[PDB]
Every structure is written in structure tokens, then in C-alpha cells.
Design a protein around this nucleic acid. Structure first.
Lengths: 82, 74, 166, 162, 71, 62, 90, 79, 83
RNA sequence: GGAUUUUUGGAGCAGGGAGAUGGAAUAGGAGCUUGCUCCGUCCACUCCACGCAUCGACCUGGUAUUGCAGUACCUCCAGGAACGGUGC
């Protein structure tokens, strides 16, 4: 029903987030709030026509995230049960 | 919540409003609204060449309101 | 004029930018001490003048004495003491051991003598046209005797500081 | 009292008068400037006044370093790898140093981003045609010893020793 | 749950990237529900622009990361 | 602030610091401080100037 | 109230994608069309899908088109512009 | 004080032709007679026409349901 | 119900501040009225935009919808803003 | 708790025209290397419509102000226009 409870239970997983400006940040999801505030640690960000930069921490808002990319070994069938 | 904007001092005063896309209008305000909607009676809009065109009483919504400058001392 | 932490320089070139002149004044004042603030305006009232407020009053006095009449961007700037206290300094604020003083003004209170002796570090006590100032340190008392020998305080008379005898 | 990581981590850092992040490292008497990797290029200005540094070298790669205060020191030689470690170095205050010859200003020509240089109160400034040699060797510098470089001084520097 | 993601970076220097491509590096002091950041003595890089205490709205924020140690 | 019978049944910080300021002022007042409390008449004029403290006398006799 | 509006309104067109396990296409604002099976949906059109294929066209900055495949992805309802259901799984 | 909702109700009762400008689009506007309104400023124009100021053309569509999120300015015309 | 940056903006009313809009317009002057929805009404204001068209107006009013940032002095960053 | 001031976005895309103009060291295809010919990607100069007008920052020369303050920015004249954004 609510996607925020499913996104909050995806902690300690290496995922990727593509923004609306073409910047893709790949990192381990460590913190998710009700407003989809993605706080990741040891992330790598690649902007549009720029070099990738590695950061120890990153905080991306929910309104600035356009798409997400999860690994194929993620238990989406078990995490969907509330 | 839902507090109205402080537009009591700018009532019945000739002010110039800016709208999105680079639009400029000038007119006297005739009321207020909690959704930042302004009614400008006998409004005149500035064209691209510089000529002013009188459009009469118009209604400007708050979604495209950029800046309103009062041309009269309040 | 009493010495303070803020030194005001005037008669400078007003044709340069404000930020470039402020950076040049900061680079000039960094050689004498830590510059806490730099007030520089370019209006019609404050044209061609600026000021630097430092942490210590001795560094500001050394910058006012050393850079007196120094050429700055083609024009020799004149440095002097500030008339009032700075706002940042007011916000942040709120041989022998005994030295003999002669020809002291009688109208000066103990607070003015404490503010004059505050250039040296903390002393033991003060005694009040003759006065006796005893410091807790020997080197601080020697520096206070070498600094107050002919100081510029109450310029109608001349103050003389000498070391006490046994 | 050498410059280490514990001395840089315990040093005060704040905003200067030009709204830049400056760390106050004065009053340390460091004989050699080293171990600057603990700052991680988080400071825009370096306040190393009143020290005992002999050579301005040994600095790591810091792209955010734009101002260097080396006043009241004994700097007599400049490192040749200053451009590879500070590409954005624009302010260099070397007043009251131990520079005696103009040949120490030859590694200073590699800093293309340097615009403000101070070489006052030095025996190298008392030599003949020192300002013309500094203008000819470093054309990127616009302000030398709190003086704006004019076109006549550039023409006099380009005429002699061409 | 704990909501300690914004409280751990309090009183620290962080660099926030804007939507138009600007970067504001300042000391984050407080926040709100609308992600209103108050950066005291902040610098604007894209060139250096002296700004100082800049109160940027949360609608123009994209990403934020740690810049260095607290002053 | 030392632990004495004066600071008993006092549980708040600012109350303790204010009562400490009060007790300090009281005791420091009621002692005999010879440095500022004393009347010396130096032999500079030897028949005048009895307003000399205990420090100005050393400065004049140095 | 909410379940009847979700099973009788436009969201039922999403609910036919997860119940019958059909393939639908989503055209986004970045000129990209992702065809896949909708696995999880919500009221804010948060679509978590599996085995998606995204196709678009790019310029060198003549241009050329391109496509790629993802095992499992999740897209918010803000960037979803067009959603088309077509019998393409058969 | 004249309310904008009361002005919209008076314009709907008078059945006069009004022109609506779009948000971030100065080249094309709409023109028609507003019949009814709602809380979300949804206009129902009968025999509406899209006027393009760049090409100087007018294309009629008929009954149009214009949303209030796109209409930035609305003025009254005599035509 | 009231945020701490909203309270800092309401407490800074009457000082020489500036508000930079999303289009680049910087309205500078004394903040006369500051509501909870970032509505800044200033008197004797000055327009210095990213376009650079610097002018002086008697009164200006910028809403919080197109407001990008606000540059305030550092007189209120010490107390009671220390938390 | 997706319907105007914040978080389910009004965002995406392209830089005017011409000239027997010039270049792809290692990176286009076809006429199945090399030489030549043709066509859907830039920068430099020239011409029409220095794309246009505006203000801010900035450089040269002349010129005025000698003034104690907590600042969007600060004298004026003329030339050049490397930069920013606004409307067409």
C-alpha cells in the first residue's frame, strides 16, 4: 500500500539513484525517512558530462530523485508483506 | 494555518506585478485572497516592443506571481 | 586620542575596488598580527578610508607606528587611532617588579591607569602627581617600563616611568 | 614544535575578513611546513605568520588553497613544485623573509593563477631592477608590493633582458 | 524512526548543491520540515562569492554532503 | 564551589552560583586586607600625603 | 472508499498490470519509454517493476537511438508522464 | 475588497468572453466563455479557441475543460 | 508549527537583508513584514537582479513561491540561535 | 498528509543564413586502403541582422572628494567591449 515503508526497509543495500538532471549516485542506503530523504554512505556520484566523484556521505532529497535501481538478488516478494 | 498574505496596506494602490515568462502588468489592487490571487482593475500590460495595452480588470493567480512593487507611498 | 584595537587608515586610493582594497589591507595587517575585522566603505562619506580591528592592541599599535605614511596603491595612507570602539570587539569583550611613575595627571582615575597598564599582563596592585605600579612578572614590568617611557597619554603633560630602587 | 596532524587538528579555524575559511597557525614556530594532509583542503587561506620556515615547499595537493600568509619568517628558497601542489594559489604574502637573490623568484613563475605578491622588507627588493625582473618573470601577477602593475612597467620589463 | 540523519550533521560545514548548478558551502545550524538550511558564513562556488549567513529554501536543494571538520 | 553547610538543601545550579557570589562578597569584605586597607605617610614630603597605600609607599621608597 | 476508487478508476488500469501480470509501457519526461511488468504500486503512482526495458534516443552533443534492460527498478509517480497498457506479453 | 472567486462568479453569470494565458507559454493562449468553476479553478469554456500570437492563427476546439494549474492570467475581452 | 529558520527569518525583521529569487532578482532592504510562508514585504527596497537592473522602489513584496535564498546579517547567528 | 508559497516537479529540446574559407595528429561511411568526390556533429575569421536594446561587475586616461564607520553597489566624462542575466 505505502511505498515509504517498503523503501525504509531497504537499508544496508547497495543501490543506485538517478536524478532529474542526469546525475547518478550509487551507494549503500543507510537512512530513509517518511519524506524519502536518502542518506547514503560511501557513495559515487556521476553528473552529466562530468567525472565520477566518491564521497563518504551523501544526502539526497525525495523530490530530486527521478528513478531507482535495485540489485537482482533483492527479496521484493518478502519485503512487500507489511 | 492558511494565513492570508499581508495585503491590507497595498489596498487601492497602483502597483506593478511580474508574472512568469517575463510578463509585466500595472494596476490598482481591488482585493486579496488566501491563494495569493490578485484582482487588478484597469490593468495595463507591457508588451515586448514597449507599448502598454489596457486589459481592464484582470485576475492574477499566485502560482505565477513573481514580485509586486508598489508604485505609491503607503 | 587613546590607543585601541581598531586602527583607521585614510587618504588612500578610492579608484580601486572595495574587496581588492580590503584584501590588500588584510594582507598588510597580517604581518603585524591577526586581523579580526576590516571595515571598508566606498560611499561619499567614507570615501578613500578604511580601518582594521585586531585582537591585540599592541599589534594594532605596531601596525599604526610601522605603516605610518606608507604608500598604498600610489597614495600614502595616514594611519591613526579610532575615535570609538568597534562593534565586534565590544561583542567579544562583553629592572624590578615595581615601577615608579612621575608627572601623572591628578584627574585620571584608577580605571584609566588600569587600562593603561592593561597592555602589560596581570599585575599585583597599583598605587596612586606620582604613582607606583608593581607587576607580578619581572619581564612584564620591564616591558611596561620600556613602553610607558614617554607614552602618549594626556598630551598636556609628559608621563615618565622608571624602575624602583631598593 | 614541528607541524604535525595533532597540531593542525587542535588549531583554530574560522572565517577571515574576506569571508574565506582561514586556519590560524601562528605562534607555533614550525621549522618546516609539512603534514598538511589532515586539513583535506578544507581551508581557503593559510595563516602561517610568525614562524621559522626556511623553504616554502613540502605541501600536498590542495586545490582550495588560494591564500598563503608567510609573513615574519625566514623563507629564503621557493620550491619548484608549487604549481603541481597549489594550482589555485592566487595570494602569496612573503613580506619580511630571507630572500636575497632574484633567482629564488624563478620557481614562483610557475604559478599562473598568482595575482597578488608581496616581496616587501626583503634584501632581494633592494637590488637593482628587482621590480622589473619580477614583472618580466611573473607576468600573471597584477599587484606587486601593494602596487598595481601598469603598461609602462610591463613595457620596461619586456624591453630589458629580452 | 530515530530521525537522527539531520541531527548528526548539526553545527558542521556542509556543501549543498543547487538545482541550477551552484554550490553553497556553509555551517548548517538548524533545519525544518521543509528542509530549510541556514548556512552561516557560506561560500558560493560554481569563482568565489562572499555571502555569509545564507538561508536557502528547501525547494532549490538537490544533494548535500560533508565538507570538513566543524570550526 | 566547595561543599559546606551553607550549600545544603540547594539543588539548582544558578542558585548555588549566586549564593557563592554572596558568600564570597561577605567574607572578602569582612577580612582585614592590609594591602588596600592601611595608612602610610611616605617621607617624600614627610609632613604631608598620608593617603599613600601600601603599594605607593614601596614605589616611592624604591 | 479508497479500494473501490482504486479498483474502479484509472488505478485499476494499474491494478490489471499486477494481478494478471501483464506488460505495460511508461513514457517519462526524459524522453525514455520503459516497458515492463508492474509489481508494486501505490496511491502516488510509485511503480516498483521487474524485468524492465528502457529505450530512448541520444545525440552526440546524426543522432541515434539506444536501449537497455534492468532486472528490477523503482520509479516515482512524479516523473511518470504517460502510462500505456497493451497486450504485449502474449 | 473584491474577491477573485466573486469576480469569477460574476464573469460566469455575465457569460462574457474571457482570454486565459498559460503558465510559461506566451505564444499560445485560450479564449472562450466560462460557464462554471470549481475550487481548483477549473474552467469550462464553450466554443473555445486557441490563439497563437506568433502565427496569428485561431483554432476552435469547442467544449474545453481547462485546469487551474496552467492558467496564469485571465482578462476580459469585448469580443 | 513554526520552524527554526522561519523563526530566524521572523526575528531578523527590520535589518538590512536581501532575498534572491529563483529568476535571480535580489530584493535588498529592511525586512518590514516576514510571514511564516516566506512572504517578504520591504519598504524603500532596491532591486539588484542577476540581470543586473539595479533600481530603487518605495515598496516591494516577494512571495515564498519563487524565492530561492535569503542573505541575512550575522547579528542573530549567536543567540538565541545556538542550539 | 499527489490541486497555487516548499516533497510525487511546467518539464523537455534546439542555438539565424551564406561563402571555389580552414582542420578530425590516433576515430565516419560509400564509390570495397593510400589520392579524389559526396553527405546528417565544432571552433576561428569575414558578410547580412558586430544577433538586437537594457543595467550590473571591469580596463585605460583626465578629473572631484581628506571624509571616524559597520555596508546589495557608489564621483563624473570618453573609448573599448573579455563576463552575467532579462524580452524579442
Amino acid at each position: 500500500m505505502k511505498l515509504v515503508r517498503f523503501l525504509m526497509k531497504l537499508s544496508h543495500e547497495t543501490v543506485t539513484i538517478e536524478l532529474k538532471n542526469g546525475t547518478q549516485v550509487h551507494g549503500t542506503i543507510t537512512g530513509v525517512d517518511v519524506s524519502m530523504n536518502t542518506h547514503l554512505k560511501a557513495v559515487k556520484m556521476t553528473l552529466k558530462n562530468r567525472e565520477p566523484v566518491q564521497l563518504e556521505t551523501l544526502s539526497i532529497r525525495g523530490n530530486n530523485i527521478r528513478y531507482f535501481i535495485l540489485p537482482d538478488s533483492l527479496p521484493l516478494d518478502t519485503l512487500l508483506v507489511d | 494555518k492558511a494565513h492570508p498574505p499581508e495585503l491590507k496596506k497595498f489596498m487601492d494602490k497602483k502597483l506593478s506585478l511580474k508574472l512568469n515568462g517575463g510578463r509585466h502588468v500595472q494596476g490598482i489592487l481591488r482585493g486579496f485572497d488566501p491563494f495569493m490571487n490578485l484582482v487588478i482593475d484597469e490593468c495595463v500590460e507591457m508588451a515586448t516592443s514597449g507599448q502598454q495595452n489596457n486589459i481592464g480588470m484582470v485576475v492574477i493567480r499566485g502560482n505565477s506571481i513573481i514580485m509586486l512593487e508598489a508604485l505609491e507611498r503607503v | 586620542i587613546r590607543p585601541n584595537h581598531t586602527i583607521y587608515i585614510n587618504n588612500m586610493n578610492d579608484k580601486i575596488k572595495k574587496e581588492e582594497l580590503k584584501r590588500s589591507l588584510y594582507a598588510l595587517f597580517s604581518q603585524f598580527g591577526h586581523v579580526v575585522d576590516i571595515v571598508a566603505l566606498k560611499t561619499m562619506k567614507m570615501r578613500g578610508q578604511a580601518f582594521v580591528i585586531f585582537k591585540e592592541l599592541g599589534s594594532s599599535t605596531n601596525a599604526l607606528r610601522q605603516l605610518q605614511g606608507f604608500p598604498f596603491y600610489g597614495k600614502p595612507m595616514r594611519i591613526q587611532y579610532a575615535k570609538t570602539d568597534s562593534d565586534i570587539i565590544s561583542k567579544m569583550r562583553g629592572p624590578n617588579y615595581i615601577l615608579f611613575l612621575n608627572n601623572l595627571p591628578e584627574e585620571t582615575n584608577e580605571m584609566m591607569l588600569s587600562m593603561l597598564f592593561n597592555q602589560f599582563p596581570g599585575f599585583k596592585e597599583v598605587r596612586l602627581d606620582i604613582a607606583f605600579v608593581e607587576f607580578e612578572n619581572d619581564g612584564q614590568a620591564g616591558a611596561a617600563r620600556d613602553a610607558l617611557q614617554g607614552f602618549k597619554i594626556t598630551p598636556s603633560h609628559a608621563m615618565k616611568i622608571t624602575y624602583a630602587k631598593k | 614544535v614541528k607541524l604535525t596532524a595533532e597540531l593542525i587538528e587542535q588549531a583554530a579555524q574560522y572565517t577571515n575578513a574576506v569571508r574565506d575559511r582561514e586556519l590560524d597557525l601562528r605562534g607555533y614556530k614550525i621549522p618546516v611546513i609539512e603534514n598538511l594532509g589532515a586539513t583535506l583542503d578544507q581551508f581557503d587561506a593559510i595563516d602561517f605568520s610568525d614562524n621559522e620556515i626556511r623553504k616554502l615547499d613540502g605541501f600536498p595537493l590542495l586545490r582550495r588553497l588560494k591564500t598563503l600568509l608567510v609573513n615574519n619568517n625566514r623563507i629564503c628558497r621557493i620550491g619548484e613544485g608549487l604549481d603541481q601542489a597549489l594550482p589555485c594559489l592566487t595570494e602569496l604574502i612573503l613580506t619580511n623573509n630571507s630572500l636575497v637573490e632574484l633567482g629564488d623568484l624563478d620557481p614562483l613563475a610557475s604559478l599562473k593563477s598568482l595575482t597578488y605578491l608581496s616581496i616587501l622588507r626583503n634584501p632581494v627588493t633592494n637590488k637593482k631592477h628587482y621590480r622589473l625582473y619580477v614583472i618580466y618573470k611573473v607576468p600573471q601577477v597584477r599587484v606587486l608590493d601593494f602596487q598595481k602593475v601598469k603598461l609602462k612597467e610591463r613595457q620596461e620589463a619586456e624591453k630589458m633582458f629580452k | 524512526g530515530k530521525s537522527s540523519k539531520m541531527l548528526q550533521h548539526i553545527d558542521y560545514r556542509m556543501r549543498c548543491i543547487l538545482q541550477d548548478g551552484r554550490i553553497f558551502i556553509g555551517t548548517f545550524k538548524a533545519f525544518d520540515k521543509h528542509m530549510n538550511l541556514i548556512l552561516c558564513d557560506c561560500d558560493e562556488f560554481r569563482e568565489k562569492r562572499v555571502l555569509g549567513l545564507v538561508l536557502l529554501r528547501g525547494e532549490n536543494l538537490v544533494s548535500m554532503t560533508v565538507e570538513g571538520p566543524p570550526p | 564551589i566547595p561543599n559546606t553547610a551553607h550549600f545544603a538543601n540547594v539543588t539548582q545550579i544558578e542558585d548555588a552560583v549566586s549564593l557563592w557570589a554572596k558568600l564570597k562578597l561577605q567574607k572578602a569584605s569582612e577580612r582585614w586586607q592590609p594591602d588596600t586597607e592601611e595608612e602610610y605617610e611616605d617621607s617624600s614630603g614627610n609632613v604631608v600625603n598620608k593617603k599613600t597605600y601600601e603599594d605607593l609607599k614601596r614605589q616611592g621608597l624604591l | 472508499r479508497e479500494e473501490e476508487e482504486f479498483n474502479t478508476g484509472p488505478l485499476s488500469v494499474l491494478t490489471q498490470s499486477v494481478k494478471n501480470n501483464t506488460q505495460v509501457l511508461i513514457n517519462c519526461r526524459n524522453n525514455k519509454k520503459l516497458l515492463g511488468r508492474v509489481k508494486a504500486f501505490d496511491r502516488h503512482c510509485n511503480m516498483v517493476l521487474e524485468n524492465v526495458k528502457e529505450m530512448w534516443t541520444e545525440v552526440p552533443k546524426k543522432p541515434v537511438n539506444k536501449d537497455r534492460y534492468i532486472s528490477k527498478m523503482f520509479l516515482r509517480g512524479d516523473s511518470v508522464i504517460v502510462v500505456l497498457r497493451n497486450p504485449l506479453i502474449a | 475588497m473584491v474577491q477573485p472567486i466573486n469576480l469569477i462568479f460574476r464573469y460566469l453569470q455575465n457569460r462574457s468572453r474571457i482570454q486565459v494565458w498559460l503558465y510559461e507559454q506566451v505564444n499560445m493562449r485560450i479564449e472562450g466563455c466560462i460557464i462554471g468553476f470549481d475550487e481548483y479553478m477549473n474552467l469550462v469554456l464553450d466554443d473555445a479557441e486557441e490563439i497563437h500570437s506568433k502565427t496569428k492563427s485561431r483554432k476552435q476546439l469547442g467544449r474545453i475543460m481547462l485546469k487551474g494549474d496552467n492558467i496564469t492570467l485571465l482578462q476580459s475581452v469585448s469580443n | 508549527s513554526i520552524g527554526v529558520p522561519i523563526k530566524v527569518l521572523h526575528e531578523a525583521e527590520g535589518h538590512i537583508v536581501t532575498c534572491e529569487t529563483n529568476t535571480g532578482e535580489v530584493y535588498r532592504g529592511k525586512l518590514i513584514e516576514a510571514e511564516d510562508n516566506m512572504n517578504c514585504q520591504m519598504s524603500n527596497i532596491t532591486v539588484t537582479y542577476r540581470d543586473g537592473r539595479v533600481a530603487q522602489l518605495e515598496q516591494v513584496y516577494i512571495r515564498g513561491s519563487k524565492i530561492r535564498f535569503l542573505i541575512l546579517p550575522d547579528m542573530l547567528k549567536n543567540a538565541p540561535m545556538l542550539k
